[PDB]
Amino acid sequence: GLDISQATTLKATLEDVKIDNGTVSVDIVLTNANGVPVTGLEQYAQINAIGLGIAKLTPESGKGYKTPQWVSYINSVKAADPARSLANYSYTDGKDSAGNPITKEVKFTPGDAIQANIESSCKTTCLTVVDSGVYRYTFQTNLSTLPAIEGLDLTYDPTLIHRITLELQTDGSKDAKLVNSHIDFLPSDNFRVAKETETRTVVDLEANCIKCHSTNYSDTSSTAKPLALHGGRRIGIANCQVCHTSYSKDPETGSPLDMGAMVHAIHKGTYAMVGYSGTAYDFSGTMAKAAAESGYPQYREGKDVSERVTLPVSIGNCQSCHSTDDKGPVDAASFKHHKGLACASCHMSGFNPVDNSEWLTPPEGQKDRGFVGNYFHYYATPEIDGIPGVNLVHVFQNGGCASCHAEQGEEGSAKYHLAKANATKLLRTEYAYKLENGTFDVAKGELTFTVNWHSDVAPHQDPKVKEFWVSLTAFNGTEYTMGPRPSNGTLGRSENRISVNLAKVETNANLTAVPNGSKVTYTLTGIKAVIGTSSVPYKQIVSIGKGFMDGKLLICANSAELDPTMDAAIDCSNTEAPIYEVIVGSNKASFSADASNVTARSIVISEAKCANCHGEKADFSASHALTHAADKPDNSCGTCHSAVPNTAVALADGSCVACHNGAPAHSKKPFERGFDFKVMIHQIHADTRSVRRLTTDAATFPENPANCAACHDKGQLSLATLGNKPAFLASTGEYSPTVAACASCHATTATDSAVIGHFETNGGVYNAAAGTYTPGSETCATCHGEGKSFGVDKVHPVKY
Numbered sequence: 001g002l003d004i005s006q007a008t009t010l011k012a013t014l015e016d017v018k019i020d021n022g023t024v025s026v027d028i029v030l031t032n033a034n035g036v037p038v039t040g041l042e043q044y045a046q047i048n049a050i051g052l053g054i055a056k057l058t059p060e061s062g063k064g065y066k067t068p069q070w071v072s073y074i075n076s077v078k079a080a081d082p083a084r085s086l087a088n089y090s091y092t093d094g095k096d097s098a099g100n101p102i103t104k105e106v107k108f109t110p111g112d113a114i115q116a117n118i119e120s121s122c123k124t125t126c127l128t129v130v131d132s133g134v135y136r137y138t139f140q141t142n143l144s145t146l147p148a149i150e151g152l153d154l155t156y157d158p159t160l161i162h163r164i165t166l167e168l169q170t171d172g173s174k175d176a177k178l179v180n181s182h183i184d185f186l187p188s189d190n191f192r193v194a195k196e197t198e199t200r201t202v203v204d205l206e207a208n209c210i211k212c213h214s215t216n217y218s219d220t221s222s223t224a225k226p227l228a229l230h231g232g233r234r235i236g237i238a239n240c241q242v243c244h245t246s247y248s249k250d251p252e253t254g255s256p257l258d259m260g261a262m263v264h265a266i267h268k269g270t271y272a273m274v275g276y277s278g279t280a281y282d283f284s285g286t287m288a289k290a291a292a293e294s295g296y297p298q299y300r301e302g303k304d305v306s307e308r309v310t311l312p313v314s315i316g317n318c319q320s321c322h323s324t325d326d327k328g329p330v331d332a333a334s335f336k337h338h339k340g341l342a343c344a345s346c347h348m349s350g351f352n353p354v355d356n357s358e359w360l361t362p363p364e365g366q367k368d369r370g371f372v373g374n375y376f377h378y379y380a381t382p383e384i385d386g387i388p389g390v391n392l393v394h395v396f397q398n399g400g401c402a403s404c405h406a407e408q409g410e411e412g413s414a415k416y417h418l419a420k421a422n423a424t425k426l427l428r429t430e431y432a433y434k435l436e437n438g439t440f441d442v443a444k445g446e447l448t449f450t451v452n453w454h455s456d457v458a459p460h461q462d463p464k465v466k467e468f469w470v471s472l473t474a475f476n477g478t479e480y481t482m483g484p485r486p487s488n489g490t491l492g493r494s495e496n497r498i499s500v501n502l503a504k505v506e507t508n509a510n511l512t513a514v515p516n517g518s519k520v521t522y523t524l525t526g527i528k529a530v531i532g533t534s535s536v537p538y539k540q541i542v543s544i545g546k547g548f549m550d551g552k553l554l555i556c557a558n559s560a561e562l563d564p565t566m567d568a569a570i571d572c573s574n575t576e577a578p579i580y581e582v583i584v585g586s587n588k589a590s591f592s593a594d595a596s597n598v599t600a601r602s603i604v605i606s607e608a609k610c611a612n613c614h615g616e617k618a619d620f621s622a623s624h625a626l627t628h629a630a631d632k633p634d635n636s637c638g639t640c641h642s643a644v645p646n647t648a649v650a651l652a653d654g655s656c657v658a659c660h661n662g663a664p665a666h667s668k669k670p671f672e673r674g675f676d677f678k679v680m681i682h683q684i685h686a687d688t689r690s691v692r693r694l695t696t697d698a699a700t701f702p703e704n705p706a707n708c709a710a711c712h713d714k715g716q717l718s719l720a721t722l723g724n725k726p727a728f729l730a731s732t733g734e735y736s737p738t739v740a741a742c743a744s745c746h747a748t749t750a751t752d753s754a755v756i757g758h759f760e761t762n763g764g765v766y767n768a769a770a771g772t773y774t775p776g777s778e779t780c781a782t783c784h785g786e787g788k789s790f791g792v793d794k795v796h797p798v799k800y
């Protein structure tokens with residue numbers, strides 16, 4: 001075999017478990033990546049950790065099925081550190097309806113607490129070499145001799161599935177010589193290995209977490225952000241689960257460490273605890289807020305972390321983390337079954353049994369169901385719930401018990417949790433439509449196009465259709481340009497874009513609709529512009545005469561319809577029922593003088609990649625809430641500013657770039673918060689945007705932003721034609737296209753004149769007077785295109 005001092009990689013497998021009079025040993029088969037046995041561990045002077053944990057999977061019971069939970073045999077009661085036992089605080093946030101400031105309160109329950117843990121300190125003392133690269137670890141901890149801990153049943157039970165975990169790290173290695181392994185087994189059947197269906201998994205790193213998280217553990221770059229915890233040494237889910245048990249808490253706050261409770265609260269932006277070395281980790285951002293507003297001496301800028309997690313899906317999007325397609329963990333359906341801490345971790349944010357001790361007692365003549373039970377059964381309200389508007393007590397009283405208490409194979413609360421997502425899918429499928437190409441008679445000012453609609457009840461005849469926008473945008477074959485803001489026009493107030501609501505034919509004097517069974521042919525008139533040096537409505541649509549048409553249909557759905565065999569679509573004017581909107585996009589059709597295709601804009605990012613984090617078909621109307629958000633997109637300022645809706649759907653086909661391009665109209669922003677699509681999206685996700693319109697909180701991007709493959713596919717960054725695009729004209733000056741693309745991270749201001757000179761040396765312009773750059777001048781591609789001398793794929797920590 002090979003000496004560990006010379007091994008560049010380690011792998012480790014666990015086997016041959018023995019437990020005898022409470023004495024636990026296990027074999028660690030140590031190899032290199034190539035499978036060569038690695039010798040010399042037991043004497044190696046560069047070992048950072050050898051940590052071995054052991055746990056049993058214990059059953060739970062109550063009404064319905066409850067999933068089994070892990071109990072570590074190794075635990076201890078931690079005292080709180082008094083100086084780091086967090087005080088309660090309050091902070092201002094918004095205003096009530098009368099215009100007075102709302103105060104919010106954050107409350108903690110410091111006090112001693114149990115923490116599960118592993119055996120860490122023994123290391124090589126506990127090892128005996130049994131073979132080449134085979135080391136027997138014999139725990140120092142005896143199962144017969146565990147100190148009693150009040151409330152915990154530590155009794156050894158061979159009939160229960162057990163787990164042992166290993167964390168092994170040498171040479172300070174982030175990856176190559178880091179291992180997390182585990183083995184699950186049934187001691188009472190001769191310590192055989194557990195079947196997938198016998199043990200507890202629930203989530204799987206690959207099926208459930210990597211859609212957002214980097215696992216590039218060896219990432220050496222400055223912006224590295226891999227999902228490795230506790231100094232870098234813990235990376236495997238199975239390892240977390242042995243410490244992060246239902247009964248473990250942080251003594252300094254009272255916060256739960258239970259895996260589900262902690263993970264739900266982190267991604268909801270409510271979790272706060274004090275960790276190693278007394279560092280406070282506040283995932284809400286509110287601690288720093290209160291410090292700045294009121295004073296909060298326990299928050300120490302630069303040491304404690306107080307940042308609001310910005311999750312790119314709703315916290316209600318369970319399928320982001322829990323598999324429903326039977327390609328995840330075999331016990332993925334665990335998320336359908338009630339578990340106090342899990343249910344509480346969203347619905348009871350900020351509540352605890354001290355500050356809300358009333359809930360410890362059920363109402364006169366009701367059964368006591370515990371703190372969380374009583375909340376769900378008795379005390380919850382829409383005003384106080386961790387999910388505003390949710391009415392659990394209404395479900396308890398009116399929805400029957402099976403709404404939350406599920407037998408195996410039933411849906412429980414998933415019936416409610418998945419209802420809008422499921423109906424949304426069905427409705428998109430049922431109302432799917434196609435836009436055929438438009439014929440634009442430009443002298444006549446008239447656009448004709450046919451929609452292939454799902455039925456012979458047309459959009460304007462279907463009261464379940466809220467609106468049906470079709471937007472057309474001029475495209476000159478090179479790149480979209482929004483252009484100056486004109487005076488208002490009948491159809492819109494943009495040079496390059498018109499949005500028309502087809503659901504309102506009868507009241508629109510410019511629109512006529514002619515049904516032919518399921519096909520509806522529309523004719524839009526009044527598309528006329530005097531073409532001059534002046535900005536006028538439809539100026540580009542008229543001078544270019546061709547471009548693309550995109551559909552955004554809004555269907556009203558019934559939030560009270562929970563049964564997927566029923567029709568979830570509902571009359572938009574209905575008053576009984578809470579209604580939500582389902583968005584249905586379309587193909588991107590062309591319009592042109594004869595309705596022939598307009599060659600597609602180049603695709604330079606991947607739709608499926610933005611969906612990894614944002615979910616499929618993410619809507620960004622709410623991103624348009626700052627400025628003139630209530631103006632409709634067929635009406636003056638709303639043409640560009642609307643959030644009701646924003647009229648774009650797809651992310652990677654240029655629909656956003658129709659506006660977000662090199663030529664923002666007016667009230668322009670400077671480069672460091674620029675409007676142009678690549679520049680805006682780079683800056684948001686790299687945290688180089690000087691100001692975000694709708695929040696003071698930087699995005700918490702869960703990948704490395706310098707991992708270009710997070711959004712770009714291999715081949716999309718040749719940069720071959722990029723220099724032929726028009727410059728981005730920001731408030732102060734213009735930036736050539738490759739310069740804008742790169743400087744959106746590398747130079748959002750002229751702070752390093754060397755980097756700015758590099759641009760200018762090689763045909764680029766940076767914050768130059770308008771008109772300076774000539775398309776074709778940038779020579780960037782020759783060195784920075786993928787695969788070149790300094791190719792973007794070579795200089796950046798990419799993971800294709």
Ligand code: HEC
Nearest residue numbers: 738739742746755759762763764778779780782783784790
């Ligand atoms: C066209 C105007 C461009 C633009 C926009 C950029 N380059 Fe280059 N580049 C080259 C070399 C050898 C380096 C140094 C590499 C290293 O030190 O590891 C660079 C550097 C850059 C950067 C990074 C700057 C920073 O420190 O932030 C950026 C953003 C960049 N370049 C952009 C090589 C070349 C060329 C070789 C002939 C060509 C041509 C270009 N670069 C052109 C451009």
Ligand code: HEC
Nearest residue numbers: 062063339340343369370372373376392395396401403404
């Ligand atoms: C969600 C809105 C619920 C509804 C509807 C019902 N129950 Fe429930 N119950 C719920 C929670 C979140 C808890 C706490 C579980 C925990 O681990 O703390 C409970 C608790 C109970 C219990 C205790 C036993 C258990 O299964 O944990 C019982 C016996 C119980 N609830 C009964 C019950 C009945 C009879 C219901 C219909 C009348 C009912 N629950 C509805 C959540 C919800």
Ligand code: HEC
Nearest residue numbers: 203208209212266309310311312313320321613700701702
């Ligand atoms: C996008 C929808 C995500 C999915 C799916 C998962 N996580 Fe996540 N996580 C996400 C964000 C935006 C953040 C904050 C930014 C960051 O990466 O730090 C997090 C954070 C965490 C953390 C805290 C990391 C740290 O700051 O200490 C943990 C421990 C974590 N996420 C775990 C986790 C697990 C186990 C997931 C699969 C079940 C998972 N995340 C999915 C976004 C997203």
Ligand code: HEC
Nearest residue numbers: 115117118229234235236239240243250251274275276281
């Ligand atoms: C026991 C050896 C642990 C294993 C394995 C993992 N975690 Fe852990 N974690 C553990 C404890 C006892 C604590 C609280 C410490 C305290 O001072 O009270 C934590 C804390 C966290 C946190 C909060 C942030 C922090 O303190 O760094 C997170 C986000 C967390 N743990 C995540 C986590 C993950 C995802 C793990 C598997 C890869 C994991 N931990 C393993 C104990 C242990």
Ligand code: HEC
Nearest residue numbers: 067202259260263267316317318320321334335337342417
């Ligand atoms: C990633 C950020 C998550 C999203 C979004 C949701 N869940 Fe989750 N959940 C997540 C993890 C990592 C865990 C812990 C797994 C473990 O080892 O303990 C859970 C757990 C739950 C549970 C408990 C399951 C059990 O212990 O058997 C429940 C009941 C649960 N989750 C429900 C749930 C719902 C309904 C969600 C959408 C509204 C949801 N989770 C989102 C990670 C994440």
Ligand code: HEC
Nearest residue numbers: 315316337338342343346387390391392395404413416420
């Ligand atoms: C965050 C990850 C959640 C966890 C964990 C649990 N719930 Fe939940 N719940 C969540 C959201 C975002 C919503 C609203 C869903 C919607 O479409 O708007 C809900 C809703 C419910 C409901 C229905 C409430 C109502 O219609 O008024 C119930 C009955 C419910 N949740 C119960 C419940 C149970 C019992 C949980 C543990 C299994 C649980 N939730 C966890 C978010 C999250």
Ligand code: HEC
Nearest residue numbers: 310311312605609610613623651699700701702703710711
């Ligand atoms: C996970 C690694 C992501 C990938 C891949 C993509 N996005 Fe993203 N985005 C992510 C986070 C954590 C956030 C912060 C969310 C918040 O609520 O603040 C964002 C934000 C955006 C935004 C801004 C939304 C807003 O400020 O109104 C946009 C427009 C956006 N993301 C778009 C987008 C596109 C087009 C992507 C593929 C090219 C893409 N994102 C990928 C996380 C991640």
Ligand code: HEC
Nearest residue numbers: 620623624625626627639640641648649655656659692693
């Ligand atoms: C013109 C009809 C637009 C299209 C199509 C899209 N956006 Fe937009 N966006 C537009 C304007 C006029 C504004 C200014 C602010 C306002 O409230 O009107 C914006 C702004 C954004 C932002 C702001 C981000 C920030 O500055 O930090 C985001 C995140 C955003 N837009 C995203 C976005 C996406 C993802 C689009 C395609 C789905 C999209 N916009 C299209 C005008 C228009």
Ligand code: HEC
Nearest residue numbers: 485493494626627636637639640664665666667668669675
């Ligand atoms: C598209 C042709 C536009 C129409 C019509 C109107 N506005 Fe606009 N506005 C537009 C853009 C692209 C931007 C952002 C510029 C950038 O470089 O980021 C704006 C900005 C504003 C602002 C500043 C606040 C902001 O969100 O940046 C205001 C106050 C504003 N716009 C107002 C406004 C009014 C009153 C309009 C009708 C009279 C109007 N806009 C139309 C693009 C377009």
Ligand code: HEC
Nearest residue numbers: 604605654678681685705706707708710711722741792796
């Ligand atoms: C998602 C959060 C992204 C990350 C990570 C990176 N880029 Fe990107 N890029 C992103 C968007 C949404 C766009 C505009 C897409 C469109 O349809 O126009 C871009 C564009 C580019 C470009 C211009 C490519 C071209 O038009 O020929 C370049 C040169 C570019 N991006 C470079 C790049 C690099 C080197 C990255 C890793 C360090 C990288 N991007 C990350 C979104 C995202």
Ligand code: HEC
Nearest residue numbers: 221222223682686705706741742745746784790792795796
């Ligand atoms: C944010 C999404 C980025 C964009 C877009 C581009 N780059 Fe980048 N780059 C970024 C980071 C965070 C780093 C540091 C990575 C590290 O290893 O620590 C880099 C690095 C470079 C380098 C290496 C030389 C250096 O100056 O560090 C080069 C040569 C480089 N980047 C080039 C470059 C070009 C030409 C871009 C436009 C096509 C570009 N980058 C975009 C982040 C981001």
Ligand SMILES: O=C(O)CN(CC(=O)O)CC(=O)O
Nearest residue numbers: 319421424425428615616617
């Ligand atoms: O396909 C589904 O059933 C669910 N969708 C929505 C959609 O396709 O409209 C997201 C997804 O596939 O994860």
Ligand SMILES: O=C(O)CN(CC(=O)O)CC(=O)O
Nearest residue numbers: 585607608611615616617618
């Ligand atoms: O459903 C499809 O056929 C393809 N998808 C993504 C996917 O599910 O992988 C795009 C979408 O549904 O919008």
Ligand SMILES: O=C(O)CN(CC(=O)O)CC(=O)O
Nearest residue numbers: 484485665666667668669731
């Ligand atoms: O286009 C305009 O309306 C003129 N501008 C440019 C800009 O809005 O950034 C400033 C102005 O109103 O005089």
Ligand SMILES: O=C(O)CN(CC(=O)O)CC(=O)O
Nearest residue numbers: 485627637665666667668669
């Ligand atoms: O452009 C507008 O319509 C309003 N203005 C000033 C103005 O030019 O009158 C503020 C702004 O654009 O930020």
Ligand SMILES: [Ca+2]
Nearest residue numbers: 250252274275
């Ligand atoms: Ca602590």
